[PDB]
Amino acid sequence: TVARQITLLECVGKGRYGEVWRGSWQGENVAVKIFSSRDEKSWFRETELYNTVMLRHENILGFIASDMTSRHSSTQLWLITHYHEMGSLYDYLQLTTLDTVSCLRIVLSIASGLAHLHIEIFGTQGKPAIAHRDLKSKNILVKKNGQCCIADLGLAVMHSQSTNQLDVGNNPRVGTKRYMAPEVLDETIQVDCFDSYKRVDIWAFGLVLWEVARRMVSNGIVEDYKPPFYDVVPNDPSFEDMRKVVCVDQQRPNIPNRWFSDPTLTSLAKLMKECWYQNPSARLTALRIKKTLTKID
Ligand SMILES: CNC(=O)[C@H]1C[C@H](n2c(-c3cc(OC)c(OC)c(OC)c3)nc3ccc(C(=O)NCC4CCN(C)CC4)cc32)C1
C-alpha cells in the first residue's frame, strides 16, 4: 500500500544511498527514501526494525510504511517517514548560528533520542536495546520546534535477553569513516559485545556535539561549520588517514578558546571530551549525557 497513494514532488537528496524525495500522501508531506541496490539490505533491516519495534519517540525519525514497488522496469525499495522540512542537522548548521537555548535543545534532544535507542525495556510495550552505528549530523533531522530526531537505522544492531548473537557482519568498519571510533578503525572492538556498539555511538555523539557547539554564538563570536577532523584529514578520508589521526596520534577536535568565556560551551566542551575517551568504558552512557544536559540548562 501507500506507495500507490504517494506522489513524488521534489528530490531533496541524492547519493550512493539512493534518493530522498518530498512526496505527498493524501495531500500530506512525507519523506520517501528510494534505496540504491547497493544499500538494499539496509532497507530490509530498517524496515524490519521499525515494523517489529515500538520505536515511537519524539527524537527518532517517525516511520510510516515500507514498500516494494516495480516502477522503472525494476523494483524500487521505498522507506516512507515523516517529512522534516528543515532537513538534516548537517545542512541546517551551515545556514545559521545558534543561541544558548537553541543549541541546548538540539543536543539534549539528540541525547534523548539516543538514550531511548540504547535503553532496553523489557516486555511488550518495551523494546530491545539498539545501537545506531552511523550517528552523524547528516543522519539527524531538525524539527521546527528546534529539537532533532535521529534517522537512518539501516546499520542498527539490536540486543535483548532473547539471544546472545547479534545481526552484525564480520566487518566492523560499517559506518562513516570520519566518525568511526578508534576501536572500530583499528578493529579491536569486541564484535560479540553489544555494549561496545553503544560506546561507538557515544564517540560519534561527541563529534556531533563539537559540530553543534561551534555554531553557538557567544559574545558575538562563532565558528564556521566544519566536519570533525577537517584540519587533519582530506575529504573522503581513508581508513589509514583516520587511524593515524585517531588511533596512533590519538588526536581530537580542538576546543575554540572563546568557548571558555561562556558557561554553556564550557560545560559542553567538558561533556564532549567525556565522549571521546580512547578507552570505550570511560565514555559516559547516553543516559548520563542526557541527565547532564538536562542540568546544564
Ligand atoms: C545524507 N543526507 C540526506 O540523506 C538528505 C536527504 C535527507 N532527508 C530526510 C531523510 C529521509 C529518510 O528516509 C525517508 C532517511 O532514512 C531513514 C534519512 O536518513 C538520514 C533522511 N528527510 C528529509 C526532509 C527534508 C530534506 C531537505 O533537505 N529539504 C530541502 C529544504 C531544506 C531546508 N532549506 C534550507 C533548503 C530546502 C531532506 C531530508 C537528508
PDB file of N, CA and C and ligand atoms in Angstrom, residues 10-15 17-22 30-35 46 50 61-62 65 78-92 95 132 136-142 149-154, ligand 1:
ATOM      1  N   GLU A  10       9.474  16.482  -5.047  1.00  0.00           N
ATOM      2  CA  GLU A  10      10.787  17.075  -5.271  1.00  0.00           C
ATOM      3  C   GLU A  10      11.829  16.241  -4.554  1.00  0.00           C
ATOM      4  N   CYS A  11      12.943  15.996  -5.243  1.00  0.00           N
ATOM      5  CA  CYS A  11      14.036  15.210  -4.670  1.00  0.00           C
ATOM      6  C   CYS A  11      14.886  16.118  -3.788  1.00  0.00           C
ATOM      7  N   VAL A  12      14.973  15.803  -2.500  1.00  0.00           N
ATOM      8  CA  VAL A  12      15.710  16.625  -1.550  1.00  0.00           C
ATOM      9  C   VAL A  12      17.046  16.011  -1.184  1.00  0.00           C
ATOM     10  N   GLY A  13      17.405  14.902  -1.799  1.00  0.00           N
ATOM     11  CA  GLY A  13      18.682  14.289  -1.537  1.00  0.00           C
ATOM     12  C   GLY A  13      18.957  13.172  -2.514  1.00  0.00           C
ATOM     13  N   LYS A  14      20.208  13.080  -2.949  1.00  0.00           N
ATOM     14  CA  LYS A  14      20.589  12.036  -3.884  1.00  0.00           C
ATOM     15  C   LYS A  14      22.043  11.688  -3.641  1.00  0.00           C
ATOM     16  N   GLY A  15      22.306  10.400  -3.480  1.00  0.00           N
ATOM     17  CA  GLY A  15      23.653   9.950  -3.217  1.00  0.00           C
ATOM     18  C   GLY A  15      23.784   8.464  -3.489  1.00  0.00           C
ATOM     19  N   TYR A  17      23.401   6.240  -1.411  1.00  0.00           N
ATOM     20  CA  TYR A  17      22.318   5.569  -0.698  1.00  0.00           C
ATOM     21  C   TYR A  17      21.068   5.423  -1.555  1.00  0.00           C
ATOM     22  N   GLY A  18      20.939   6.235  -2.607  1.00  0.00           N
ATOM     23  CA  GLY A  18      19.754   6.313  -3.428  1.00  0.00           C
ATOM     24  C   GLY A  18      19.250   7.739  -3.574  1.00  0.00           C
ATOM     25  N   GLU A  19      17.972   7.961  -3.258  1.00  0.00           N
ATOM     26  CA  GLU A  19      17.363   9.269  -3.308  1.00  0.00           C
ATOM     27  C   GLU A  19      16.402   9.437  -2.139  1.00  0.00           C
ATOM     28  N   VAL A  20      16.251  10.684  -1.694  1.00  0.00           N
ATOM     29  CA  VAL A  20      15.201  11.052  -0.766  1.00  0.00           C
ATOM     30  C   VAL A  20      14.344  12.113  -1.438  1.00  0.00           C
ATOM     31  N   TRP A  21      13.046  11.898  -1.394  1.00  0.00           N
ATOM     32  CA  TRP A  21      12.056  12.760  -2.003  1.00  0.00           C
ATOM     33  C   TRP A  21      11.125  13.308  -0.934  1.00  0.00           C
ATOM     34  N   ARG A  22      10.683  14.541  -1.157  1.00  0.00           N
ATOM     35  CA  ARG A  22       9.455  15.033  -0.557  1.00  0.00           C
ATOM     36  C   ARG A  22       8.306  14.523  -1.428  1.00  0.00           C
ATOM     37  N   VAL A  30       5.335  13.635   3.036  1.00  0.00           N
ATOM     38  CA  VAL A  30       6.067  12.501   3.596  1.00  0.00           C
ATOM     39  C   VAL A  30       7.452  12.545   2.991  1.00  0.00           C
ATOM     40  N   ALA A  31       8.415  11.947   3.694  1.00  0.00           N
ATOM     41  CA  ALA A  31       9.743  11.721   3.142  1.00  0.00           C
ATOM     42  C   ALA A  31       9.792  10.299   2.611  1.00  0.00           C
ATOM     43  N   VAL A  32      10.255  10.144   1.375  1.00  0.00           N
ATOM     44  CA  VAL A  32      10.361   8.837   0.730  1.00  0.00           C
ATOM     45  C   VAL A  32      11.828   8.613   0.388  1.00  0.00           C
ATOM     46  N   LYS A  33      12.416   7.568   0.950  1.00  0.00           N
ATOM     47  CA  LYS A  33      13.770   7.175   0.572  1.00  0.00           C
ATOM     48  C   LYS A  33      13.657   5.979  -0.357  1.00  0.00           C
ATOM     49  N   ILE A  34      14.217   6.123  -1.551  1.00  0.00           N
ATOM     50  CA  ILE A  34      14.289   5.071  -2.556  1.00  0.00           C
ATOM     51  C   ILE A  34      15.722   4.539  -2.519  1.00  0.00           C
ATOM     52  N   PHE A  35      15.898   3.308  -2.044  1.00  0.00           N
ATOM     53  CA  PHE A  35      17.237   2.805  -1.792  1.00  0.00           C
ATOM     54  C   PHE A  35      17.949   2.424  -3.086  1.00  0.00           C
ATOM     55  N   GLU A  46      16.149  -1.878   8.217  1.00  0.00           N
ATOM     56  CA  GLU A  46      15.441  -0.732   8.772  1.00  0.00           C
ATOM     57  C   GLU A  46      13.959  -0.989   8.795  1.00  0.00           C
ATOM     58  N   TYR A  50      11.687  -1.170  12.296  1.00  0.00           N
ATOM     59  CA  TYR A  50      10.537  -0.297  12.529  1.00  0.00           C
ATOM     60  C   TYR A  50       9.239  -1.074  12.621  1.00  0.00           C
ATOM     61  N   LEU A  61      13.330   9.438  14.106  1.00  0.00           N
ATOM     62  CA  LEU A  61      12.527   9.646  12.896  1.00  0.00           C
ATOM     63  C   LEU A  61      11.331   8.710  12.872  1.00  0.00           C
ATOM     64  N   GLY A  62      10.140   9.297  12.688  1.00  0.00           N
ATOM     65  CA  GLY A  62       8.888   8.582  12.628  1.00  0.00           C
ATOM     66  C   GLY A  62       8.653   7.806  11.348  1.00  0.00           C
ATOM     67  N   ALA A  65       5.742   3.721   6.606  1.00  0.00           N
ATOM     68  CA  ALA A  65       5.490   2.497   5.845  1.00  0.00           C
ATOM     69  C   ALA A  65       6.745   2.178   5.054  1.00  0.00           C
ATOM     70  N   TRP A  78      11.213   1.293  -1.102  1.00  0.00           N
ATOM     71  CA  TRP A  78      10.794   2.565  -0.527  1.00  0.00           C
ATOM     72  C   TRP A  78      10.692   2.492   0.992  1.00  0.00           C
ATOM     73  N   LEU A  79      11.214   3.530   1.648  1.00  0.00           N
ATOM     74  CA  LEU A  79      11.016   3.762   3.077  1.00  0.00           C
ATOM     75  C   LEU A  79      10.338   5.112   3.200  1.00  0.00           C
ATOM     76  N   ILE A  80       9.179   5.143   3.826  1.00  0.00           N
ATOM     77  CA  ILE A  80       8.374   6.358   3.940  1.00  0.00           C
ATOM     78  C   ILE A  80       8.276   6.767   5.411  1.00  0.00           C
ATOM     79  N   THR A  81       8.650   8.006   5.702  1.00  0.00           N
ATOM     80  CA  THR A  81       8.729   8.528   7.057  1.00  0.00           C
ATOM     81  C   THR A  81       8.093   9.920   7.124  1.00  0.00           C
ATOM     82  N   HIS A  82       7.947  10.437   8.337  1.00  0.00           N
ATOM     83  CA  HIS A  82       7.566  11.839   8.478  1.00  0.00           C
ATOM     84  C   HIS A  82       8.559  12.714   7.724  1.00  0.00           C
ATOM     85  N   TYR A  83       8.064  13.836   7.243  1.00  0.00           N
ATOM     86  CA  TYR A  83       8.854  14.796   6.478  1.00  0.00           C
ATOM     87  C   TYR A  83       9.208  15.977   7.367  1.00  0.00           C
ATOM     88  N   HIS A  84      10.498  16.185   7.564  1.00  0.00           N
ATOM     89  CA  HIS A  84      11.005  17.287   8.377  1.00  0.00           C
ATOM     90  C   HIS A  84      11.579  18.309   7.417  1.00  0.00           C
ATOM     91  N   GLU A  85      10.772  19.324   7.109  1.00  0.00           N
ATOM     92  CA  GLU A  85      11.100  20.279   6.051  1.00  0.00           C
ATOM     93  C   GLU A  85      12.426  20.998   6.289  1.00  0.00           C
ATOM     94  N   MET A  86      12.905  21.052   7.529  1.00  0.00           N
ATOM     95  CA  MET A  86      14.173  21.723   7.792  1.00  0.00           C
ATOM     96  C   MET A  86      15.361  20.918   7.289  1.00  0.00           C
ATOM     97  N   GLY A  87      15.191  19.629   7.084  1.00  0.00           N
ATOM     98  CA  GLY A  87      16.292  18.824   6.594  1.00  0.00           C
ATOM     99  C   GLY A  87      17.267  18.452   7.680  1.00  0.00           C
ATOM    100  N   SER A  88      18.475  18.070   7.238  1.00  0.00           N
ATOM    101  CA  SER A  88      19.430  17.445   8.124  1.00  0.00           C
ATOM    102  C   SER A  88      20.096  18.481   9.031  1.00  0.00           C
ATOM    103  N   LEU A  89      20.599  17.997  10.164  1.00  0.00           N
ATOM    104  CA  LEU A  89      21.377  18.866  11.042  1.00  0.00           C
ATOM    105  C   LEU A  89      22.610  19.368  10.313  1.00  0.00           C
ATOM    106  N   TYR A  90      23.252  18.489   9.546  1.00  0.00           N
ATOM    107  CA  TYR A  90      24.411  18.912   8.758  1.00  0.00           C
ATOM    108  C   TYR A  90      24.108  20.148   7.927  1.00  0.00           C
ATOM    109  N   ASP A  91      23.007  20.128   7.190  1.00  0.00           N
ATOM    110  CA  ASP A  91      22.732  21.266   6.308  1.00  0.00           C
ATOM    111  C   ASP A  91      22.269  22.492   7.097  1.00  0.00           C
ATOM    112  N   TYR A  92      21.429  22.276   8.127  1.00  0.00           N
ATOM    113  CA  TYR A  92      20.956  23.386   8.950  1.00  0.00           C
ATOM    114  C   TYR A  92      22.126  24.170   9.577  1.00  0.00           C
ATOM    115  N   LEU A  95      23.643  26.954   7.629  1.00  0.00           N
ATOM    116  CA  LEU A  95      22.808  28.085   7.271  1.00  0.00           C
ATOM    117  C   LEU A  95      22.657  29.094   8.388  1.00  0.00           C
ATOM    118  N   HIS A 132      23.101   2.448  17.073  1.00  0.00           N
ATOM    119  CA  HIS A 132      22.833   3.054  15.765  1.00  0.00           C
ATOM    120  C   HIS A 132      23.897   2.705  14.734  1.00  0.00           C
ATOM    121  N   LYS A 136      25.706  10.604  12.967  1.00  0.00           N
ATOM    122  CA  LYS A 136      26.427  11.780  12.453  1.00  0.00           C
ATOM    123  C   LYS A 136      25.390  12.842  12.138  1.00  0.00           C
ATOM    124  N   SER A 137      25.868  14.044  11.806  1.00  0.00           N
ATOM    125  CA  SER A 137      24.961  15.158  11.591  1.00  0.00           C
ATOM    126  C   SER A 137      24.092  14.974  10.366  1.00  0.00           C
ATOM    127  N   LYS A 138      24.613  14.305   9.340  1.00  0.00           N
ATOM    128  CA  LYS A 138      23.792  14.020   8.163  1.00  0.00           C
ATOM    129  C   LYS A 138      22.696  13.004   8.420  1.00  0.00           C
ATOM    130  N   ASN A 139      22.783  12.248   9.504  1.00  0.00           N
ATOM    131  CA  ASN A 139      21.744  11.277   9.863  1.00  0.00           C
ATOM    132  C   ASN A 139      20.875  11.771  11.014  1.00  0.00           C
ATOM    133  N   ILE A 140      20.803  13.076  11.201  1.00  0.00           N
ATOM    134  CA  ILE A 140      19.965  13.703  12.213  1.00  0.00           C
ATOM    135  C   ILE A 140      19.163  14.797  11.505  1.00  0.00           C
ATOM    136  N   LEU A 141      17.864  14.851  11.777  1.00  0.00           N
ATOM    137  CA  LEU A 141      16.960  15.816  11.156  1.00  0.00           C
ATOM    138  C   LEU A 141      16.484  16.836  12.192  1.00  0.00           C
ATOM    139  N   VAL A 142      16.282  18.068  11.748  1.00  0.00           N
ATOM    140  CA  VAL A 142      15.887  19.155  12.649  1.00  0.00           C
ATOM    141  C   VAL A 142      14.394  19.375  12.510  1.00  0.00           C
ATOM    142  N   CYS A 149      15.559  14.789  15.521  1.00  0.00           N
ATOM    143  CA  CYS A 149      15.305  13.356  15.626  1.00  0.00           C
ATOM    144  C   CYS A 149      16.385  12.577  14.900  1.00  0.00           C
ATOM    145  N   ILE A 150      16.728  11.422  15.462  1.00  0.00           N
ATOM    146  CA  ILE A 150      17.787  10.601  14.877  1.00  0.00           C
ATOM    147  C   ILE A 150      17.192   9.770  13.752  1.00  0.00           C
ATOM    148  N   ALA A 151      17.928   9.663  12.658  1.00  0.00           N
ATOM    149  CA  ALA A 151      17.431   8.945  11.473  1.00  0.00           C
ATOM    150  C   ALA A 151      18.418   7.867  11.014  1.00  0.00           C
ATOM    151  N   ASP A 152      17.922   6.986  10.143  1.00  0.00           N
ATOM    152  CA  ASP A 152      18.713   6.033   9.372  1.00  0.00           C
ATOM    153  C   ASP A 152      19.155   4.871  10.245  1.00  0.00           C
ATOM    154  N   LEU A 153      18.279   3.888  10.396  1.00  0.00           N
ATOM    155  CA  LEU A 153      18.522   2.745  11.252  1.00  0.00           C
ATOM    156  C   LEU A 153      18.993   1.523  10.469  1.00  0.00           C
ATOM    157  N   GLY A 154      19.499   1.713   9.239  1.00  0.00           N
ATOM    158  CA  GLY A 154      19.820   0.577   8.392  1.00  0.00           C
ATOM    159  C   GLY A 154      21.063  -0.201   8.820  1.00  0.00           C
TER     160      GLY A 154
HETATM  161  C1  LIG B   1      22.747  12.258   3.894  1.00  0.00           C
HETATM  162  N1  LIG B   1      21.766  13.327   3.643  1.00  0.00           N
HETATM  163  C2  LIG B   1      20.493  13.015   3.170  1.00  0.00           C
HETATM  164  O1  LIG B   1      20.199  11.841   3.008  1.00  0.00           O
HETATM  165  C3  LIG B   1      19.496  14.126   2.940  1.00  0.00           C
HETATM  166  C4  LIG B   1      18.092  13.805   2.386  1.00  0.00           C
HETATM  167  C5  LIG B   1      17.607  13.509   3.860  1.00  0.00           C
HETATM  168  N2  LIG B   1      16.269  13.901   4.267  1.00  0.00           N
HETATM  169  C6  LIG B   1      15.389  13.050   5.001  1.00  0.00           C
HETATM  170  C7  LIG B   1      15.624  11.611   5.357  1.00  0.00           C
HETATM  171  C8  LIG B   1      14.692  10.617   4.995  1.00  0.00           C
HETATM  172  C9  LIG B   1      14.921   9.244   5.260  1.00  0.00           C
HETATM  173  O2  LIG B   1      14.030   8.276   4.907  1.00  0.00           O
HETATM  174  C10 LIG B   1      12.837   8.697   4.424  1.00  0.00           C
HETATM  175  C11 LIG B   1      16.140   8.794   5.818  1.00  0.00           C
HETATM  176  O3  LIG B   1      16.398   7.492   6.111  1.00  0.00           O
HETATM  177  C12 LIG B   1      15.652   6.980   7.204  1.00  0.00           C
HETATM  178  C13 LIG B   1      17.069   9.774   6.175  1.00  0.00           C
HETATM  179  O4  LIG B   1      18.285   9.364   6.719  1.00  0.00           O
HETATM  180  C14 LIG B   1      19.157  10.387   7.189  1.00  0.00           C
HETATM  181  C15 LIG B   1      16.828  11.138   5.911  1.00  0.00           C
HETATM  182  N3  LIG B   1      14.207  13.681   5.216  1.00  0.00           N
HETATM  183  C16 LIG B   1      14.350  14.995   4.691  1.00  0.00           C
HETATM  184  C17 LIG B   1      13.464  16.097   4.673  1.00  0.00           C
HETATM  185  C18 LIG B   1      13.819  17.282   4.061  1.00  0.00           C
HETATM  186  C19 LIG B   1      15.090  17.481   3.479  1.00  0.00           C
HETATM  187  C20 LIG B   1      15.532  18.750   2.757  1.00  0.00           C
HETATM  188  O5  LIG B   1      16.754  18.935   2.690  1.00  0.00           O
HETATM  189  N4  LIG B   1      14.660  19.609   2.032  1.00  0.00           N
HETATM  190  C21 LIG B   1      15.054  20.811   1.240  1.00  0.00           C
HETATM  191  C22 LIG B   1      14.974  22.175   2.016  1.00  0.00           C
HETATM  192  C23 LIG B   1      15.877  22.077   3.242  1.00  0.00           C
HETATM  193  C24 LIG B   1      15.998  23.468   4.031  1.00  0.00           C
HETATM  194  N5  LIG B   1      16.127  24.636   3.107  1.00  0.00           N
HETATM  195  C25 LIG B   1      17.225  25.396   3.616  1.00  0.00           C
HETATM  196  C26 LIG B   1      16.536  24.117   1.760  1.00  0.00           C
HETATM  197  C27 LIG B   1      15.410  23.380   1.159  1.00  0.00           C
HETATM  198  C28 LIG B   1      15.964  16.401   3.499  1.00  0.00           C
HETATM  199  C29 LIG B   1      15.628  15.155   4.095  1.00  0.00           C
HETATM  200  C30 LIG B   1      18.811  14.466   4.275  1.00  0.00           C
END
